[PDB]
Amino acid sequence: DGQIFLETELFYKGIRPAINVGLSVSRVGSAAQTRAMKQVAGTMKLELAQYREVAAFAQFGSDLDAATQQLLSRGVRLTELL
Amino acid sequence: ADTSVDLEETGRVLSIGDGIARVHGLRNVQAEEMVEFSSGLKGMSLNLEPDNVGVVVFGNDKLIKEGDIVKRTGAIVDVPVGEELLGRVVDALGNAIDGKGPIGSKARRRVGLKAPGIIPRISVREPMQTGIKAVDSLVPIGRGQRELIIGDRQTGKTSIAIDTIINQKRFNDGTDEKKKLYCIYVAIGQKRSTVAQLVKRLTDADAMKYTIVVSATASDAAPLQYLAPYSGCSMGEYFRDNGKHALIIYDDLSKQAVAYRQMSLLLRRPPGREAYPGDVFYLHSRLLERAAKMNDAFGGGSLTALPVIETQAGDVSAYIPTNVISITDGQIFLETELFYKGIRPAINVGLSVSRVGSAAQTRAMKQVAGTMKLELAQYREVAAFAQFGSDLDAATQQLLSRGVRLTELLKQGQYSPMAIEEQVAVIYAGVRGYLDKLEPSKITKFENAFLSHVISQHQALLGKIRTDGKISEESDAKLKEIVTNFLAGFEA
Amino acid sequence: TTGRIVAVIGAVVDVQFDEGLPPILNALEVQGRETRLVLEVAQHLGESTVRTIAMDGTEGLVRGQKVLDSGAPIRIPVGPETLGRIMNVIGEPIDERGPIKTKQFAAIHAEAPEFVEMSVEQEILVTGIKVVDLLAPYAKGGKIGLFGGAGVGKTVLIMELINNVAKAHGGYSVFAGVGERTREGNDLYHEMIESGVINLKDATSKVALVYGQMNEPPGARARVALTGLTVAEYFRDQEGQDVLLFIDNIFRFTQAGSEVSALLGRIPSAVGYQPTLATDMGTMQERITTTKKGSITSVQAIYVPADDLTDPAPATTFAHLDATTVLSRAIAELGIYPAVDPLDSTSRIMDPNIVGSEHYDVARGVQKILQDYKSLQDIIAILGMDELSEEDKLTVSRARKIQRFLSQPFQVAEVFTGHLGKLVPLKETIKGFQQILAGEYDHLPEQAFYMVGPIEEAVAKADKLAE
Amino acid sequence: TTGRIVAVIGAVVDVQFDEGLPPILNALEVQGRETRLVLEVAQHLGESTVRTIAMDGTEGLVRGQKVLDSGAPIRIPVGPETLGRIMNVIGEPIDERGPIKTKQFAAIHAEAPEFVEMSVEQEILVTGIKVVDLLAPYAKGGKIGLFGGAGVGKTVLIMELINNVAKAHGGYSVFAGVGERTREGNDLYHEMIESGVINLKDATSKVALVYGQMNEPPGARARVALTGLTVAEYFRDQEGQDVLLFIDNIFRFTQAGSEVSALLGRIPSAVGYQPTLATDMGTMQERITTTKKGSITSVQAIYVPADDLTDPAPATTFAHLDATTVLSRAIAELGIYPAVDPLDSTSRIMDPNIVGSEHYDVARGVQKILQDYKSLQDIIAILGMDELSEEDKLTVSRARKIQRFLSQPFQVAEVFTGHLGKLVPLKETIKGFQQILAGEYDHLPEQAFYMVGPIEEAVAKADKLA
Ligand SMILES: Nc1ncnc2c1ncn2[C@@H]1O[C@H](COP(=O)(O)OP(=O)(O)NP(=O)(O)O)[C@@H](O)[C@H]1O
Ligand SMILES: Nc1ncnc2c1ncn2[C@@H]1O[C@H](COP(=O)(O)OP(=O)(O)NP(=O)(O)O)[C@@H](O)[C@H]1O
Ligand SMILES: [Mg+2]
Ligand SMILES: [Mg+2]
């Protein structure tokens, strides 16, 4: 019912546990969480999946509207927190 | 007297399974000879072995059990042939499956005949019109030729064949009898609903009347799908050997290759690359050489072949595609990118090639094709810098503007094939520069309006290009006056 | 007739008959066993011996053990009675609610409808899913294939379609779990009881269930697909009405055929698959069709092995469909759910003469700009963004907004998305992408378009994402 | 003697003799058939059985049918009256022009020339064509790889080579078509008569045609390259000629042999090819060399699969290739005929030790001057023509006159072109190009050197009118 994938790049880059937010999934989902965890992790997975994409696309020097700056700032902080 | 068993002309099933019957006896069976089981089923003796015969079952193998009496009845594996079949949808062996009763067939031809030799053939020179601009101008096809349709799934492979069938109505309803073309479409391993969607699309064109549809669908057994290409071929040869013209489309040969492979693997013949037996090249080489153009010594008739090959991830270097590419006289490569990018039919101008080419297209088309071949060649070299070229020289900037506009001209919708004279006119406009000032997006609408006009007002001019078979200096000037003033009015 | 087991290997059991020999496809009954064990005759091996495939575990089987020939292939209960009931491979109710009390017993080995029996009529079945309805919409009474690798959303997508179509569907529906999770089936049993498709009290049940999940031995997972379609077959032919067949997963049919292929005595084809792969699928898929007698809207979840579409099993399946919906792990990776590939999904009804020339041109235009962006992706990734002109990089920002507006919060994926599920009408979808292509939303950021319903919400999300 | 059919499986037939067995490679005559059927012994299975590979369709065969051993391998007509004749793998005339009445018949199999019969001399086969003889010289009794098919006049180049060897060296040629498309067979046939090499009336023919068509089983496609080699072998040893052997195409000979090994039941080697690939190539390619009596020089048309040069097929072929001739679209579209790429075609005998001291420096000079031209091409298109230095302006104008002098009109193509054909002798070419490099024709125009024979016809053309 889903998998947890770990990469050496993420491991060596600092991220531990080295979980690949994009590739890993959970097939039970929020139904497996406490209503306390759901209140803070309800949309976090799909958020970071969108962040991990826009992170490698925004490194091309393009001037970024504050709306995609907001997701960039949030994604860096939440990766450090996990 | 008792338990004698005529082992010479009969025998019994030693073991049945997976469409393979190992039969005891049959001491007088010839290789590739049709047999008959207790249940009334047919089968072929493809393996002759010391102690048995391996027979490929023509149907459901539940009906065959152990010790079932297998009979020689001296059968010659042959299919009904002739003009009585046109308009009908027959099965892999000639039996009608369109619920319209029996076929009034009188002539009947073997499916395992040899191709004509070197001698009785003459060079390919008569045109075979697809009604597809891209094809007739860049990858031209002629009568007696073999040309391969080859692309990934849903790349527009069938549509090319489809539009060609519909194109023939023009010639097949007129008086010019030499220029008539009879159509034969062989569905090999397809699903019945798609094969039903097909014949309707041919009925609605009024194209069915001159089309023989040989069908062996995915539910039909392994040997049925193996004979189906050859069964159609014999039907096409009738016309060929009797001074007429026939066009056959094996759709598709990749699926016959699968149907053959099964049998070999299960008859336990050695496996090779991708589990294919040694004689699978030989399976297709003898099928496609059977298409030829006969000399006036042998009636002067012709059969023209169009194999379809499905590639996976564009890999044309897969064993079966590699086979058919060399087998045939040329290929047309259709690509997924070109498709969704817009370029439909998604014919890759670069890779696509015909050996017969130049000598197959009319002297009218020749007059504008080689020019387009050269110009699109010089376009594709610079094509990548179509936007990133502000500071390019005016030469390559012309060669980019020339190419993009020709590419728009070769675009086409399905089901609307164009006569050879309608083709050269719309290609004459872009090749001689009379569209180099028109905005790219406006070209398709112009073609539609300019063509709508020349048919509606200048019937004699197009007729002259058909009659003369070439664009004379008179017609050349007459075309220039129409295009320049129609295009000027267009932009008003 | 009585037979003795002469060999047991895996799920392949050879039996010998002294007198009358049972033909191919016939179901055999193994004598002296706790739960019924059915064998299916696959081959005649000679010397009065037959090779069979067991429909359950062959553990505990003694050589010489007696086996009676049931005289026919597996015959299962068929009729309105089957509704609301979970049948297994052999039609023994695994729901624990007594016998299926039916008038008729049809066989799971039947003949494919004839060429003359075929129907050609086709209309659009509006799903309410933006990705399908726009680019490769489903034909009513048509064959629908859902390709996808391991963990991209074949199942999640097939579930939404049941909610969106079957629930408000007047006729009968037949779900058939083939080789997937027993767990997935349980959820759906309870979630079709809650909703009210399956009524436990009365006979207003609209769904008949069949299951042979990845717990069962190959032999079973190889045949349970036929059990599901034969249920559908009655409802189509002997009751005329519209049927909604849902299979998940149909690749398991081919896989279970391979698990035994070597033991039957086969030279392996390509990719360690069975040589009969083509004809095995042909006699099965051709039975899943709409005929002049009756309609069957089929939706089949097709697994993709090692994320390769060119894998023989799913690659052969392509030629059997009317509309194909293909899923990518790379698309799902970017959080884009559903992970439908806009360049890989093809419909038979994507003809302007059916869906309308506005519908067609919008969709073709939607793909072109995403196609164009895909070509630019590798160029801009190394050589910056500035090198694109004001009409080039305008398409880039559009394509990413078209890419993200294709994402849709499903009503089934509430547990994953964290959003309320959305259902978008046909004309609301076409207007959606038409405007973005026109460039009427070039001012709004991409994130406004990510995971919304109708287009008004993409504006709404921008306003909230502002302050 | 006599044997019976014990097994028919596809294109592989098994035959049981009672007494003595035919040695491996002996041809077998199947009796009572419509046409001729040949079975080539491949194995001895034991129990007085042989495993044979057919050269024609194995339909209609009855188990027990009497099969005759011919006591020898596949024997074919050899001798001068095989010229202008289309032969098949078993000798049979397939031009419907009456049976080939040759005095001698020779078996298509035979051991390679002994170590003692080898030629210790490395010599150059002068082709008369300039591009070839100067830059990519053919080795006499060597093997040449011809890249690129038709659409550039492959057929012509072949025919001119046949003409010019028969002319300059008095040696005949043999075309062995491995996997010949029947349309292309017919088309190549009349192209040879219409041009002059095949003479349907008298005996002035210069080529022997052998056709292994595609619609023939793998046995026929795998052995026809020998049936052609044996007709060529007669003119090497019996008449002492410098023979010419065309194989088109060599890849379809490799794929032919792969099919056979796949059919017999041998475990396939790398990339799907046969385990016997090295030898399957060696036992044929080593018959093509210079002997004491004569020499066979073979031009082979190569198909590379997936354009992969490391693919075993071209990799095994390259070990035997002494020179290459690239026929290119790019050069053909410019107007240079023959369509040979001057830098892309390379030769083993491009060595001061083999051809000579002069030949080498002149060829390399031409090679360098064309690379320099390519090296200045971007500087030409995007800088300003008139800003090259004196030495850069000069080498550009000299280089253009070099690639034009590569151009040569062909004798074979007098019926089409209407212009006179040329055979440029060896030393004429060497000195001709040396003078342009030395600048002796810095004053002459570009169009002067285009489509001319020696350098003389170029200066004369330079006059024209003004
Ligand atoms: N020239 C064209 N213009 C517009 N649409 C086209 C054209 N050619 C094909 N199509 C469409 O593209 C789809 C695929 O075309 P088709 O000729 O069936 O290719 P195919 O290779 O036979 N598909 P398949 O048999 O499943 O591999 C069809 O649904 C057509 O509607
Ligand atoms: N629309 C969606 N929204 C959010 N998450 C989704 C969506 N679709 C799929 N997912 C997630 O992706 C995972 C894969 O879904 P699933 O339907 O089980 O794919 P699958 O193709 O059936 N995998 P498998 O059958 O094991 O090869 C699930 O765990 C979901 O959480
Ligand atoms: Mg098709
Ligand atoms: Mg699933």
Q: Where are the domains of chain D?
A: 1-73, 74-349, 350-466
What is the distance between the terminal CA atoms of chain D, rounded to a whole angstrom?
81
- Is residue C396 annotated as involved in ligand binding? no
Return the residue whose CA atom lies nearest to atom 2 of ligand 2. C337
Cβ atoms of D25 and D40 closer than 8 Å: yes
Which residue matches tokens 């909230």?
C464
Name D368's Cβ contacts closer than 8 Å, sequence gap at least 6. Answer: none
Is the minimum CB–CB distance between B255 and chain C shorter than 8 Å? yes
Alpha carbon B265 to its chain centroid, in Å, reads 28
Q: B-chain residues within 8 Å CB-CB of C322?
A: 193
Q: How far apart are CA C415 and CA A43, in angstroms?
A: 10
Q: Torsion angle of alpha carbons D283, D285, D291, D295, nearest 10°?
A: 140
How far apart, in Å, are the Cα atoms of D85 and each of B11, D81, D233, D409?
49, 8, 16, 28
Residue B198 and residue B217: Cα distance in Å, rounded? 13
To the nearest whole Å, the CA of C199 is away from the closest chain B CA by: 35
Residue C431 C-alpha to ligand 2 middle, in angstroms?
28
Give, as one character, the DSSP assignment of residue B360. T
For residue C358 the two structure tokens come to 């506005």
Label residue B109 left, alpha or beta by phi (over 0 means left) and psi (-120 to 50 means alpha): beta
Residue C47 CB contacts under 8 Å (≥ 6 apart), including other chains: C16
Q: How many CB atoms lie within 10 A of CB C18?
A: 10
**Cβ-contact D84, D198 below 8 angstroms:** yes
User: Quick check: B12 and B23 in contact, CB under 8 A?
Assistant: yes
CA atoms in the 13 A half-sphere facing the CB of B382: 22
Terminal-residue alpha carbon distance, chain C: 81
Distance, CA of C409 to CA of C387 (rounded, Å): 35
Q: Which of C288, B273, B326 is nearest to D179 (CA)?
A: B326
Cα B334 to the chain's mean position, in Å?
A: 14
User: How many Cα atoms occupy the beta-carbon half-sphere of C40 within 13 Å?
Assistant: 25
C217 closest CA partner among C70, C39, C68, C85:
C39
Chain D residues in contact with B349 (beta carbon < 8 A) = none
Is CATH 3.40.190.10 correct for D1-73? no
Token digits of residue B276: 């294919």
The contacts of residue C283 (CB under 8 Å, 6+ apart) are B218, B219, C112
List of E strands, D272-387 = 295-302, 323-326
A27 flagged as catalytic: yes
The tokens 């610079």 sit on which residue? Answer: B382
Task: Measure CA of the first residue to CA of the last residue in chain A; give whole Å.
Answer: 22
Rounded to whole angstroms, the Cα distance separating C181 from D242 reads 76
Lining residues, ligand 1, CB within 6 Å: B 153-159, 310, 344-345, 412-414; C 319, 351
Count of other CB atoms within 10 angstroms of residue D313: 23
According to DSSP, residue B142 is labeled: B
Contact C82, C105 (CB under 8 A): no
Judged by CB atoms closer than 8 Å, whether chains meet at C417 and A46 is answered as yes
- Ligand 2 pocket (Cβ < 6 Å) reads A 2, 25-27, 29; C 148, 150-156, 180, 249, 303, 337-338, 410, 413, 416-417
D31 in the Ramachandran plot: left (φ > 0), alpha (ψ -120 to 50) or beta? Answer: beta
Residue nearest to atom 27 of ligand 2 (CA): C150
D85 is in an annotated binding site: no
Three-state DSSP string of chain C: CEEEEEEEECCEEEEEECCCCCCCCEEEEECCCCCCCEEEEEEEEECCEEEEEECCCCCCCCCCCEEEEEEEECEEEECHHHCCCEECCCCCECCCCCCCCCCEEEECCCCCCCHHHECCCCCEECCCCHHHHHHCCEECCCEEEEEECCCCCHHHHHHHHHHHHHCCCCCEEEEEEECCCHHHHHHHHHHHHHHCCCCCCCCCCCEEEEEECCCCCHHHHCCHHHHHHHHHHHHHHCCCCCEEEEEECCHHHHHHHHHHHHHHCCCCCHHHCCCCHHHHHHHHHCCCCCECCECEEEEEEEECHHHCCCCHHHHHHHHHCCEEEEECHHHHHCCCCCCECCCCCEECCCCHHHHCHHHHHHHHHHHHHHHHHHHHHHHHHHCCCCCCCCCCHHHHHHHHHHHHHCCCCCCCCHHHHCCCCCCCCHHHHHHHHHHHHHCCCCCCCHHHCCCCCCHHHHHHHHHHHHC
Structural domains of chain B, ranges and CATH numbers in brackets: 6-75 (2.40.30.20), 76-361 (3.40.50.300), 362-492 (1.20.150.20)
**Lookup: tokens for D373:** 């031209």
Q: Does B74 touch chain D (CB under 8 A)?
A: no
Instruction: Give the distance from CA C461 to its chain's centroid.
Output: 34
Closest CA to B138 of B343, B365, B446: B365
How far is it, in rounded angstroms, from Cα C375 to Cα C385? 14
Calpha distance B307→B254 (Å, rounded): 9
Q: Do chains B and A touch (3 or more CB pairs under 8 A)?
A: no
Q: In one letter, which amino acid is B22?
A: R
Integer Cα distance of D190 and B77 in angstroms: 36
- For residues D359 and D350, what is the distance between their CA atoms, to the nearest angstrom? 9
Rounded to whole angstroms, the Cα distance separating B215 from B192 reads 9
Instruction: Kindly tell me whether chain C and chain B come into contact, counting contact as 3+ Cβ pairs under 8 Å.
Output: yes
* Cα D221 to middle of ligand 1, angstroms: 37
Residue keyed to tokens 């016997």:
D276
DSSP class of residue B266?
H
Per CATH, which fold does D350-466 belong to?
1.10.1140
3 state DSSP class of B391 = coil
Q: Give the separation between CA D261 and CA B79, rounded to whole angstroms.
A: 34
DSSP-derived 3-state class of residue D106:
strand
**Residue B103 to residue D292: CA distance in whole angstroms:** 70
Which residues are D27's β-sheet partners? D40
Question: In whole angstroms, what is the distance from residue D109 CA to residue B483 CA?
Answer: 68
Cβ neighbours of residue D46 closer than 8 Å, sequence gap 6 or more: none
| CA B147 / ligand 3 centre spacing (Å) | 16
3-state secondary structure of D383: coil
B209 close to B273: Cβ distance less than 8 angstroms: no
Burial of C28 (0-12, 13-18, 19+ CB in 10 A): buried
Tokens of C246: 């849902």
Exposed e or buried b for every residue in C280-308, given b needs 16+ CB within 10 A?
bbbbbbbbbbbbeebbbbbbbbbbbbeee
- What contacts C207, CB < 8 A, 6 or more positions away? C83, C84, C166, C172, C173, C174, C175, C192, C197, C198
The first and second tokens of residue D431, run together, are 């000195």
* CATH entry 3.40.50.300 includes domain C74-349: yes
**Sign of torsion over alpha carbons D307, D309, D315, D318:** positive
| Residue range C350-467 in CATH 1.10.1140.10 | yes
**3-state SS, residue B87:** coil
Taking alpha carbons only, the member of C134, C121, C182, C133 closest to residue C160 is: C133
Calculate how close chain A gets to C272, using CA atoms only, in Å. Answer: 26
Residue found by looking up tokens 């596809």 in the block: D10
In the reported structure, the alpha carbon of residue A13 is separated from the centroid of ligand 2 by a whole-number distance in angstroms of 29
Is the preceding peptide bond at C249 cis, omega within 30 degrees of 0? yes
In which residue are the tokens 């004459």 written?
B428
Among candidate residues D51, D140, D143, D154, the one labeled active-site is: D154
Contacting chains of A (3 CB pairs or more, <8 Å) are C
Distance C309 CA to ligand 3 centre (A): 18
The distance from CA C87 to its chain's CA centroid, rounded to whole angstroms, is 18
Residues near C248 by beta carbon (within 8 Å), at least 6 away in sequence: C154, C155, C158, C175, C176, C177, C178, C180, C184, C300, C301
From CA D265, how far away is CA D278, in angstroms rounded? 18
Distant-in-sequence contacts of D442-446, Cβ < 8 A, 24+ apart: D442/D394, D442/D397, D442/D398, D444/D401, D446/D400, D446/D401, D446/D404
Neighbours of B78 (CB within 10 A): 17
- D156 annotated ligand binder: yes
From chain A, the residues in CB contact with C462 under 8 A are 67
Beta-carbon contacts of D313 under 8 Å, excluding residues fewer than 6 positions away, are D251, D254, D255, D273, D304, D305
Nearest atom (ligand 1) to Cα of B344 = 1
Q: Tell me the C-alpha distance between C96 and B320, whole Å.
A: 52
Are B275 and C118 an interchain contact pair (Cβ–Cβ within 8 Å)? Answer: no
Residues paired with C67 in a beta bridge: C3, C30
Task: Report d(CA B249, CA B146) in Å as an integer.
Answer: 10
Tally of residues, chain A: 82
Angle at C437 between CA C431 and CA C443, to 5 degrees: 100
Chain C residues whose beta carbon lies within 8 Å of the beta carbon of residue A26 = 416
CB B139 within 8 A of CB B147: yes
Query: C185-199 burial, b if ≥16 CB within 10 A, otherwise e?
Result: beebbeebeeeebbe
Q: Do C385 and A62 touch (CB under 8 A)?
A: yes
Resolution of this PDB entry, in A? 3.5
Cβ–Cβ gap B48/D61 under 8 Å: yes
Cα-Cα-Cα-Cα torsion C444, C447, C452, C456, nearest 10 degrees, comes to: -10
Residue whose CA lies nearest to ligand 2 atom number 29: A27
Tokens for D307?
A: 């354009």
Do B128 and B169 contact (CB within 8 A), yes or no? no
Experimentally, the structure was elucidated by X-ray
The alpha-carbon gap from C179 to the nearest alpha carbon of chain B, in Å, equals 23
The span from the CA of B353 to the CA of C31, in Å, is: 67
Q: How many inter-chain contacts (A to C, CB under 8 Å) are there?
A: 65
Distance between CA atoms of residues D231 and D241, nearest Å: 12
DSSP designation for D197 = S
B31 at interface of D, judged by CB pairs closer than 8 A? yes
Task: State the nearest Cα–Cα gap between C334 and chain A, in angstroms.
Answer: 5
